[model samples]
Target chain A: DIVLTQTPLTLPVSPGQRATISCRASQSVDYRGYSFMQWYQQKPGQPPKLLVYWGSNLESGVPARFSGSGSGTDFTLTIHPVEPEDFATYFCQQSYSTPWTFGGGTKLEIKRTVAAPSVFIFPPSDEQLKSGTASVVCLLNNFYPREAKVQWKVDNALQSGNSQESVTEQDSKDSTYSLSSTLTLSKADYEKHKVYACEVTHQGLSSPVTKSFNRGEC
Target chain B: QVQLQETGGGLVQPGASMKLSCKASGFTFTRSGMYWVRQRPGQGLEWVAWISPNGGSTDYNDKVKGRATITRDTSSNTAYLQMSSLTSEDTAVYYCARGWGGMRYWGQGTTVTVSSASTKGPSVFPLAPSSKGGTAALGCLVKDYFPEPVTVSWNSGALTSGVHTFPAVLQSSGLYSLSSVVTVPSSSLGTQTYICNVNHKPSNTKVDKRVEPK
Candidate 1:
């Protein structure tokens, strides 16, 4: 039997940068043996949608930009010019036998520009742990057939966030996406919080995400 | 073309149990076994157990002891798993796997969450979360996707539970998935690492994370 292992649990990519995912099996799963390979993408909280199947064949509705290539026990699933919408967990599942397993997952995050230490307008911050009221947002960044959710947590307690208008970006890839939440909190509520975090539920990834942040005196 | 569908409860109130069924279409059910598994948000894949529709034999992941029960109905070509003592930690994508030539096949998976407070009591088997001692649950969760039935084997290793492997699940959509659980004790957990390696198409292996008492 073969086992699969992935690298860089977290991958930071700038738009147009080449992002790669590797799937290596413990033994040679040859084609003659009818061992096919596949890859899937799971946005926070949404079900896993297949991207590539049969080792390299793209699923019927997948985009052309997303291509897979490799053979035998070693394989690769690649997304060229990684887009913001592509930021999520990706998994590699084998079609071998009982007790099928998946790669731990490689998370792709879109590059965000940090605000210079100035400007009183708050600089469009997306952090869930800021003082003076809090708002949280999760987006698909410019890829399609993808979905994810966003929620806020104060002291490990889940705070309800309102659903806002979904924002979509039109691009060469049929990348369609929508936003599902907007969490709001008052200054008093935010100040008393020890850890404010965002939880994005998704499949294929090694674990569910509860990204927490500490408040720093900015 | 064959498709697999998973019909089961989507939400499991905390403390209560959720049982989901995968019905197979387009093939003979008893020819192969079905597997059931769990994948939590971001946590690596976990094998719960498996069942053979033919003989009704079964195997389970050591960590989920007393937490999961797997069975199959050869007459309807349907496989079922009862997940007991639900909790937030039990929330995950439950998949079905198929077995073929020592390789493990997989289904797209069904999403279920454990949300009732009462269901969040004692941990399943508390297998250490380390890369070593943790229990390895690996089994197929699907039953009807392959051109033929698959086989399984426990590679040479000291067996405490005698190599547990579950049967495959054949969903209505014609997809497949499987699950299996193997535990390495804390003492043996340090020196030995158990692996439930799926040897099907593009063979895959998942090693248990070792657990060190905090």
Candidate 2:
């Protein structure tokens, strides 16, 4: 079966706005004469909700404002007048093959003054140890107000040195920003049974958004 | 409003057969189709089969094509899945969903585990490494595990920042072959041991392999 890749990775839209997410299949999703495509919305900690099937037909109880279009290899899922509750991860699956495959996922987030960034810590690799150092990356995604501050801490103590760099990039379509910070640690400190945390603070947040990683967790 | 509930045996012996039932209520049972989906522990979902109650037509995933049979009984307002030649890999949580334009309503999932006196664990292949000037790629292969789902993790003194990929391709003999790859800097190769851990939940068995960079 062909692979389906979703672009933009994340979509940030304000309430009452419109959002269009794309899914591109590695090959044609059309089989025999039918476009076997489906779209789903998965809310945090909830079962996935089917939104569209067979390319454009809306599932029962799905609002008319939610629609899908496109066929073959390219498809689009459009949400008109996006609602507050519409903020979730959207996935596209192709049933053209025996074992169907789904795209990675596109997160739909609410863009507001006080949006809290979702943080993820990537696992460390052995190459860092070979070089007498290790590097870990923390991704802060789908947050509003690009002026957010990021800090790194090792074992709960604030990290101080020339070992951290953060880069922020904006989505040309949605105008939302994604920030990633890389933290470099010496091999001695990296091998210790300690925890590494990425903390993000924004004007809209009452508290910092933080995610942590520990040794042997990969 | 349609509600579907799935019920079946909680355990099945290897090479045995079993029948699963999905009962529908609050709607006309023969008016639409019902599809079966399954998910292994800590894994993603897989489509099994679908049957049209009104038309008696059926569609199945190729993975379980001849091994599964889908039928409907309007008199009882239920859909059935009969699977034979079972293996430990068949253990999973199964669900029945009501399909109109798409699957909108789902039944509470039924957990099924395959029980066998003799369980086989996965075989981990030697870690293959390829290096450039500063970076190196390490690949691990796990083959021939029963009761399908396995969680793979890499440990090298610390959680490393790298991509972990699992490609699950079922072999013709009803077993699974999975692989994972993690790339790190070449300078870290000989300093610490790189370990790959493969966990099988059905048997509470875990196997690990240490990569020695030469």
Candidate 3:
């Protein structure tokens, strides 16, 4: 099985700036004389649409702003002067062999010129705490677009083990999305870590915003 | 104003073959490339084959490498795909699309149903490296039949939950391939032969393959 790797899992590009997403194939994706790399775009809640194929050919009816280049082991999907609608995720695929594969998606999101996402953490209601396990909420506010890639890290070990992670709503006034994630820690699991932090990563954030929790803080 | 339309498909059975045609209008068919994409019921699109009429080239999915043949006629402005040894796994809505850029101008898909009057089930084998042990693993491979639902039980599951069956794999021959392995304690590795029993509901057949660890 040929493996494809994608880098910079998240891309921060403000509108009108160029966005470049990369996909690298472990082996040459060239079959015969042609390069079989293809690129696609996927908006939230929408089916992925092909934008480029044959490494660099723009698909018919696709806007000129989107293009692709490179070939074989290294290929790229480039979106010029990114538009608001381009805040969706993009991926590259290879058809040079059986068991076709896709690169991990690179989300071209709004690199907020104004403010990065505001993240806050909430403890489970006193109602559910002593019941054996408790649920925690990592709420993010004022991020543009309808999506965000969020994972819950336990003890900072990068374990999103228990998550669905969907953004619940969008505030049309400022044209930003504000969503939350809920993670559960068994009572014993809670005592294992003295503190828990919920960090939000988006294009707008230079790094990420973190909010930690300890029941005593509430 | 360019358009693509797919036509030609009927009831095809296992081991038989079928061909579908894509007729194009409002564009120069000979100048543009064409590709076939298929969507199985409730599944994502799978790219099937690429035919470059202008470049005099054609490529197909590995699973269809030997089974699919693509041809075009400049005079008729039509392209065709003939896939052989069809089986139920090939049942799909196949689309023909213009493909120089990406798959633009997809033809309304031609629905193909690969039906079999009676299934003979699958043929099983003991693939070499015949079986691996130390952990004492016995492998059995099944191939060449369709309606893909077949079961492989190791010694009628004599061991615990130590038997692992893999997902069905598509073969270039247009048949399905599969595999299963049974694990045993190293102490009992070579005392006797391990049996693989296959039961297929649609096929009135009983199939078995055995492996002996040396």
* Cα lDDT tens digits for candidate 3, A25-139: 9999986667888887765434457799889888877899999888679988888888766766687878676556667677666655454555655555444455665556565
Candidate with the larger TM-score of 1 and 2: 2
Candidate 2 ranges beyond 4 A from true positions: A1-12, A25-36, A44-46, A93-105, A113-218, B9-19, B26-31, B40-44, B53-57, B84-92, B113-214
Q: DockQ of all candidates, in order?
A: 0.06, 0.11, 0.06
Off by over 4 Å in 3: A1-20, A28-50, A53-61, A80-218, B8-18, B29-31, B40-45, B54-57, B91-93, B101-104, B108-214
Q: Candidate 2 lDDT, tens digit per residue, A32-108? A: 65788899886633456899998988887889989998989999999998877786778888866545576777888
What ranges in model 1 sit over 4 Å off? A31-36, A112-218, B1-17, B23-35, B41-44, B47-62, B65-67, B71-78, B84-214
Tens digits of per-residue lDDT, candidate 2, B1-214, equal 5677788756578889889998887767346567787766545567788876575568887778899998988788888999999887788888777765556787768777787644456666544453224566564556566655677787732644553434455544455556555657678887856788778765577878776542
lDDT of 1 by residue, B4-24 (tens): 567685656778888888876
How would you encode candidate 1's per-residue C-alpha lDDT over A1-218 as one tens digit per residue? 35778766877676888888888877655557354676778665445567887677777767877887777788888888687688677888765553455678787766544311100011013222342434433222222333344555668887753323233222223323322233445556655766766665543233445544565422
* TM accuracy, model 2: 0.48
Ranking by TM-score: 2, 1, 3
